[PDB]
Each structure stands twice: as structure tokens, then as C-alpha cells.
Amino acid sequence: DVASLRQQVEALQGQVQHLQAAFSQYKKVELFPNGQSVGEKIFKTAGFVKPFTEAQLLCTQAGGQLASPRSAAENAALQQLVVAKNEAAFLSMTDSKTEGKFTYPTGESLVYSNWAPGEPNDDGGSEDCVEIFTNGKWNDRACGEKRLVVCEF
Amino acid sequence: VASLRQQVEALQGQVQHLQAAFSQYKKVELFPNGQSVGEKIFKTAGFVKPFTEAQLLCTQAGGQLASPRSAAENAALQQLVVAKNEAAFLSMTDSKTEGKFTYPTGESLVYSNWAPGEPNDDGGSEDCVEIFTNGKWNDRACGEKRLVVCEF
Amino acid sequence: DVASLRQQVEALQGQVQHLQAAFSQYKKVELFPNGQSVGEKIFKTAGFVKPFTEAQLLCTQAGGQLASPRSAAENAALQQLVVAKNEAAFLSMTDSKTEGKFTYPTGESLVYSNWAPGEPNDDGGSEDCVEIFTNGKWNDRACGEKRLVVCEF
């Protein structure tokens, strides 16, 4: 029975090696041209624009959330997608509860930001959502405007 | 046996890490053109075709045209139709026996969601089925062009 | 002890058998409708057009390269995507001004080719890139024209 278990372990090693190698190829295929991997996070664009409320619902129904960069490296990876599509995108964070205090959907306060000079400026008094430009910088923006839909998984 | 335990313990971690990575890439795969329901996956091509061309695309890809067999499956399919704002073909036809809709296997329907007054065989020649944005079904001529959605 | 190993191996067998089924289904989902697998090579189209230099960059940044069919079987698989999108696509190969002829990106001479009759013809004196037509035949084409982006992985 030690001999039999040894045979079974050897077969499993071969099967796991096969899946690892096959899946490694498919990761690259899948992310071309609308995805970007950075650390343990994956950004994926829908390739079209929506208002914030509708963008948020699409990401949540897909089992993820709107793009939420938590470091300069995550932000630069997101910027790569935004540049390639040439369309600014919504982020997840809003200051709807408390004006000036932007938070994640959980209510946690920001661990990273990349605001353009002078932003947030609440231009017109009702900019409660956040966009990322093609240069990677952030701007507060009215939630009713349409921007590129990018989710994180 | 001591070597075997080391090898088994190593496999536990490798398999755990592979399943996590696979699960994450599968979620990414389905956004925004797919829907998972039970063991079934629907995926839209994002364009319209006549029935025979749509059928061939799905079969060449190793699947078949969307074939909702329950209310839950129909609702999942309805989400893609609503997202693209384009009615889609189902797999089922009454080509062989008028009035008797079947799956590609020849099996009779186990579920239906016909709109009021349907199926009506309009013009004496509606043998394919479209699903609308409200999730209801209408029989339609097979030569019309509709959203291509396959199941896998 | 041996009883312990048997319980661990039985669990692992269940997990791997599930992954094999799930992965095989997933491959079909990913390849529909923009991918084609041939031997150990996968072609995937971006589903849009670009000039050559931008096309080449997109493939390299994704961890692949521009489509480079090396056999009749590979060419016929690529032709299926080109036919499906009804758009001729760029290949990887270019006219080397040091070698005085078409080469792969490495500088090596072409082996397999499928030139259309009368090609390459350097029409107008500046056709330094290569495209594949919807009939599968090859044509030299100006690099600044926009053609379907297809990468290989």
C-alpha cells in the first residue's frame, strides 16, 4: 500500500505540473488586450463608458469592485489601460457622506492618492466621484458624467 | 513514507495556490461578456448573425447556442441581452415537427418563457427562437440576424 | 500514518479532477470568439486595427509577439480569425535594410511563406511590413497603414 500511494503521488505531481504550465500560457492570452496584472490584483476594462452608479453595479455583479489603486505601482498599471483606451476612468472612492473626505466603498479612508495639482476642487459644488486621467493623475468629477468602466478582481 | 508526507504536504500548497489563481482568472474572463450559472457558462460574441451561422460558430467553439433549461438560467442569459441591448437566438427549433420545439439533440423542452400569444409561426415560417430584453421568448424566422450567445 | 496519507491523497485527487474539468471548459470560453489554438501556439486578435509599430508594442507588452505562422497548419488557423473579422492582419516580419530582404524580428531568413501571386512587390517603394489577407495569402504593405492586431502566445 506504500507502493500504491507512491504511484498515486507521482501521477498527481505530473497532473499538477501540466495544469500549471497550460494555465501560465492562458493567463497571458486572457489579459490581452483589456487586462493588467499587478501583484495579486487584476484590472479589467469593459471597453465602454458609463455613469458612476451603473459602473459600480457592473463591477459588483461581476464579483469585483471599481478600480481602487492602493499604491503607486497599482496606479501605474491602471494608467497603462487608461492610456491604451485613451479614455479617463472612474475609481471606486467617493466623498458623498462627508464633503472632502474620500473613502473606499467599505468606508475606510484612503491609503494612497495621486491628485492633480489643486484637486479635489469640488468644481460647481457637486463633484463627489473620482476619475483617473491618461497621465495617471486623479480629479474629483460629477458622478453623473460618463467615464471608462474598469473593474478590479 | 516520511518522504511521501513531505511530497503530499507540498502538493496541498501547490493545489491550493493553483485553485485560487484559477478562480480569480475565471471571474476576470466573464467580465463583461459572460455569465456563470451552476455548471453552465454563457458568453456572447458581441455581434449579430443569422441562425445557421450563429449555430456553426458555437459548435466550432465546442459549445452550442444558449439553451436555458430553468428560470435561473433564463435570468442569467437575460443579463447579457440587456447589457448589449440586442435580442439573442436560442438553440431550439421546430423545423422537424411544426409546433414542437426541441434542443439540438432532439429532446423536447423542459422549460419555456413564451411571451403572450407566442409561439405563433408568423407567416407560416418562424422556426427559430429569440429572447428579448425582458427575458420573454418569441418564435422568429431563422434568416433574421440576432445576438450570438453560446453556452459551454 | 498510512491511513493519514490515504485521506490526504484522496482529497487531492478530488481537487485535481475538478480543476481538470474546470480548466478544459474555461479554455473553450476564453478562445470564443477571438482566439485559435494550433499545436502549442495560440493566436488571439485584439479585435481592432493599428499601424505596425503600435501593433508590435501591444503584443510585446502583453508577453507575446505579432503573429508569425511557421507552417500551413498555423497559417490556416490564423486565416480563420482574419476571415471572421473580415480584416487583413499584420504579421511579425519586416524588410531588413541590413539584410536586403524580409526577415523575422530576430533577423533570420523566412522559411514557410504563403505569398500571393505577384508579391512581395514593394508597391510605391515603401512596403516594409507584411499582412495576411482573408484568403490566407501574404502581401507586403506599408507599415503606417492600419491593419488587424493579432498576437501569438
Ligand SMILES: O=C(O)C(=O)C[C@@H]1O[C@H](CO)[C@@H](O)[C@@H]1O[C@H]1O[C@H]([C@@H](O)CO)[C@@H](O)[C@H](O[C@H]2O[C@H]([C@@H](O)CO)[C@@H](O)[C@H](O[C@H]3O[C@H](CO)[C@@H](O)[C@H](O)[C@H]3O)[C@@H]2O)[C@@H]1O
Ligand atoms: O476638466 C474639465 O474638463 C472641466 O470640467 C473644465 C472646466 O472648465 C471650466 C474652466 O473655467 C471649469 O468649470 C472647469 O475647469 C476647472 O475644473 C477642472 C476640474 O477640477 C473639473 O473637475 C480643472 O481641471 C480646471 O483646471 C485645469 O484647467 C484650467 C483651464 O485650462 C480650464 O479651462 C487650467 O488653468 C488649470 O491649470 C492651472 O491650475 C493648476 C492647479 O492650481 C496649476 O497646476 C496650473 O499650473 C495652472 O495653470 C488646470 O489645468 C479648472 O479648475
Ligand SMILES: O=C(O)C(=O)C[C@@H]1O[C@H](CO)[C@@H](O)[C@@H]1O[C@H]1O[C@H]([C@@H](O)CO)[C@@H](O)[C@H](O[C@H]2O[C@H]([C@@H](O)CO)[C@@H](O)[C@H](O[C@H]3O[C@H](CO)[C@@H](O)[C@H](O)[C@H]3O)[C@@H]2O)[C@@H]1O
Ligand atoms: O425598437 C427598436 O429598437 C427598433 O429599432 C425597431 C423599430 O422601432 C420601432 C418600434 O416600435 C419600429 O418602427 C421598428 O421595429 C420594426 O423593425 C424591427 C426590426 O427591423 C429590428 O428589430 C422588428 O423587430 C419590429 O418587429 C417587432 O416589434 C413589433 C412591434 O412591437 C414594434 O414595432 C412587433 O409587432 C413584432 O412582433 C410581430 O412580428 C414578429 C415577426 O416580425 C412575430 O414573431 C411576432 O409573433 C409578432 O407579434 C416584433 O416583435 C418592427 O417590424
Ligand SMILES: O=C(O)C(=O)C[C@@H]1O[C@H](CO)[C@@H](O)[C@@H]1O[C@H]1O[C@H]([C@@H](O)CO)[C@@H](O)[C@H](O[C@H]2O[C@H]([C@@H](O)CO)[C@@H](O)[C@H](O[C@H]3O[C@H](CO)[C@@H](O)[C@H](O)[C@H]3O)[C@@H]2O)[C@@H]1O
Ligand atoms: O489596396 C491595395 O491593395 C492597393 O494598394 C491598390 C493599389 O492600386 C494601385 C493600382 O495601380 C497600386 O498602387 C496598388 O495595387 C497593386 O498592389 C497591390 C498590393 O501589392 C499592395 O501592397 C496588389 O494587390 C495589386 O494587384 C492586384 O490587382 C491587379 C489589378 O491591376 C487588376 O485587378 C491584378 O493584376 C493583380 O493580379 C494578381 O493577383 C491575382 C489574385 O488576386 C492573380 O489571379 C493574378 O495572377 C496576379 O497577377 C492583383 O489582383 C496591384 O499590384
Ligand SMILES: [Ca+2]
Ligand atoms: Ca465633493
Ligand SMILES: [Ca+2]
Ligand atoms: Ca475637480
Ligand SMILES: [Ca+2]
Ligand atoms: Ca414554426
Ligand SMILES: [Ca+2]
Ligand atoms: Ca412569433
Ligand SMILES: [Ca+2]
Ligand atoms: Ca504589395
